[PDB]
Amino acid sequence: PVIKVRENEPFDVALRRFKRSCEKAGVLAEVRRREFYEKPTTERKRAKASAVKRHA
Amino acid sequence: FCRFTEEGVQEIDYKDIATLKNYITESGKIVPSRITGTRAKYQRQLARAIKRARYLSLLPYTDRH
Amino acid sequence: SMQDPIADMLTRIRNGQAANKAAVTMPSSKLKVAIANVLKEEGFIEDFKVEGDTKPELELTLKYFQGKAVVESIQRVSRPGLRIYKRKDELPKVMAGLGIAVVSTSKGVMTDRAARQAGLGGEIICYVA
RNA sequence: AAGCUUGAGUCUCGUAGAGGGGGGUAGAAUUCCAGGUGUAGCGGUGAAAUGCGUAGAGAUCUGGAGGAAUACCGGUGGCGAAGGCGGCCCCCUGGACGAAGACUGACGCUCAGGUGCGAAAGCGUGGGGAGCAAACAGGAUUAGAUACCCUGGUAGUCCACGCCGUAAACGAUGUCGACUUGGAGGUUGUGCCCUUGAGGCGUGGCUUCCGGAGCUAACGCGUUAAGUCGACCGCCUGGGGAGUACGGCCGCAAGGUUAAAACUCAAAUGAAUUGACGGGGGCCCGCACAAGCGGUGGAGCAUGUGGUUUAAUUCGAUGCAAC
Ligand SMILES: [Mg+2]
Ligand SMILES: [Mg+2]
Ligand SMILES: [Mg+2]
Ligand SMILES: [Mg+2]
Ligand SMILES: [Mg+2]
Ligand SMILES: [Mg+2]
Numbered sequence A: 001p002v003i004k005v006r007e008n009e010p011f012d013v014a015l016r017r018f019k020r021s022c023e024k025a026g027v028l029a030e031v032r033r034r035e036f037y038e039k040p041t042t043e044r045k046r047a048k049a050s051a052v053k054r055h056a
Numbered sequence B: 001f002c003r004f005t006e007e008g009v010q011e012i013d014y015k016d017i018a019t020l021k022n023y024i025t026e027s028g029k030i031v032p033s034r035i036t037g038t039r040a041k042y043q044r045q046l047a048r049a050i051k052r053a054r055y056l057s058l059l060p061y062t063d064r065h
Numbered sequence C: 001s002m003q004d005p006i007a008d009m010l011t012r013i014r015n016g017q018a019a020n021k022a023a024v025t026m027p028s029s030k031l032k033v034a035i036a037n038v039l040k041e042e043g044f045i046e047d048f049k050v051e052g053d054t055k056p057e058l059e060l061t062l063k064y065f066q067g068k069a070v071v072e073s074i075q076r077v078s079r080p081g082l083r084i085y086k087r088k089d090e091l092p093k094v095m096a097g098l099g100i101a102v103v104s105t106s107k108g109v110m111t112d113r114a115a116r117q118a119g120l121g122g123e124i125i126c127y128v129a
Numbered sequence D: 001a002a003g004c005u006u007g008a009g010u011c012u013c014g015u016a017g018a019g020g021g022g023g024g025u026a027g028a029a030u031u032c033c034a035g036g037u038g039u040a041g042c043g044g045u046g047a048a049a050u051g052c053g054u055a056g057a058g059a060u061c062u063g064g065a066g067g068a069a070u071a072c073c074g075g076u077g078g079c080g081a082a083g084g085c086g087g088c089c090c091c092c093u094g095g096a097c098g099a100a101g102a103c104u105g106a107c108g109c110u111c112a113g114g115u116g117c118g119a120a121a122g123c124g125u126g127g128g129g130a131g132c133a134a135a136c137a138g139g140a141u142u143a144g145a146u147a148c149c150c151u152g153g154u155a156g157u158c159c160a161c162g163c164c165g166u167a168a169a170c171g172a173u174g175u176c177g178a179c180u181u182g183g184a185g186g187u188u189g190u191g192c193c194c195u196u197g198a199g200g201c202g203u204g205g206c207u208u209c210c211g212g213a214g215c216u217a218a219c220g221c222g223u224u225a226a227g228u229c230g231a232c233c234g235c236c237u238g239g240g241g242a243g244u245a246c247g248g249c250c251g252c253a254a255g256g257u258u259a260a261a262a263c264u265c266a267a268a269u270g271a272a273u274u275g276a277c278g279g280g281g282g283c284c285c286g287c288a289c290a291a292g293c294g295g296u297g298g299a300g301c302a303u304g305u306g307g308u309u310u311a312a313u314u315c316g317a318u319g320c321a322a323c
């Protein structure tokens, strides 16, 4: 998320925008996922669990 | 809401840059069918087109490189 | 495979009885038709009718007397896996007479009682109550 | 002996697909090699140390070299007999599914033996080797730590042609064929009606959840049944001994497969229920902690116990809730 600062715009606002962009990307989450190797089976199980949760 | 269905097209081409850029984010990452409201085959086609563009370096893999 | 037609028909009938169906449609045969006729004679069903030239379809109208199914239990004893043949005196009496058995009798397919009356045995198709 | 189409097939247009096999190639990222800038630490954890780094590491920019896997799309998405299969593109090719129709006329089903496919790991020669990572080493941790944790690190993971032939190969539901109130959907098509607009009519195939009848030991399954029938097989007959021995057959080997007996036990389980318990989750509460105020424990003294002792040290009280 390459972010540039506009004229007539505060630093805090820019920071907030950057944060939003990051959130949109889901980079941190991806990193977390990749931090340790996941077995395919485990991933599948997780997905299934998520699907189950979705149903309410 | 699916635009492709509304249009009534056979194939989504990698030629049209303006349509493809609407379906990816700024960083160079594809937007899901669940958010956009697209049909699945159409979504797949779109993805393929995006990939082709990336290969040809029409739309980037990553925005920082 | 479509191995036993008679058994299939019986199953369909049972299903109809369970789910309270007014009319049950099924692929038809001459022996099947005869069986249906026999059943009608016995008093289990309203009316049967076969319709179809290339693909014959037997339609069976079922009775539900006093809010309950008339054909309570309907099961084959003779089977494609194991055929049961019975002698004249060896013929069963299903539920002490109050209930019947479909028998392939050599002088026309009929009831076990009827066969006994005649003096003839054969293959005991189904047990009907 | 003679025939039929609905079963089962083949032909016309299509339909999508991580269906395979073979060949190319793309990106990021890691590693390493080389160089440039740069300086005091880097890396790691719960905290540390081993490690790496005053030789200039990490950091970081450029140039590469490679090996592997394909982020995002990606979804109880799809396809396959299953095992499985996801970057992209081509070649070869299997199958499925459908729509109108045309034709063959039972060509059907299952399958003992038999044959083929069969994740992983392993095995075999030859490659290839970036990461990861058994083993292995060091550090920790620890009462000990052959572990969990860190730093490293060989085989292996990757291909080539073979062997192996096992997995909780699991929908723990054989395979096929038939029938029985439903819904929410999703997925994949397709044909009409003025598509009068994404849409409408219905109406066929495919998969997911809830659930009626029913069923079951219940849990639950539930038009994809574990329901109502039929076929056909396969397998079970208390647990352990033991899916082991011995023998055969297969295997390069590992082992696999078939498959006991003696002896032994009165249970072995399965579901569910009340409990209790959890170093599970949620709630709340107590001077429970925190925040505080003084103690005891150290000393002497009083007292009570125990222990030893005495001729006898009456007896009882023993976590709190005996002292
Ligand atoms: Mg003919
Ligand atoms: Mg392997
Ligand atoms: Mg090898
Ligand atoms: Mg390790
Ligand atoms: Mg060690
Ligand atoms: Mg096995």
Ligand SMILES: [Mg+2]
Pocket: D169
């Ligand atoms: Mg599996």
Ligand SMILES: [Mg+2]
Pocket: none
């Ligand atoms: Mg099994």
Ligand SMILES: [Mg+2]
Pocket: D210
């Ligand atoms: Mg259910």
Ligand SMILES: [Mg+2]
Pocket: none
């Ligand atoms: Mg063995």
Ligand SMILES: [Mg+2]
Pocket: none
């Ligand atoms: Mg004291």
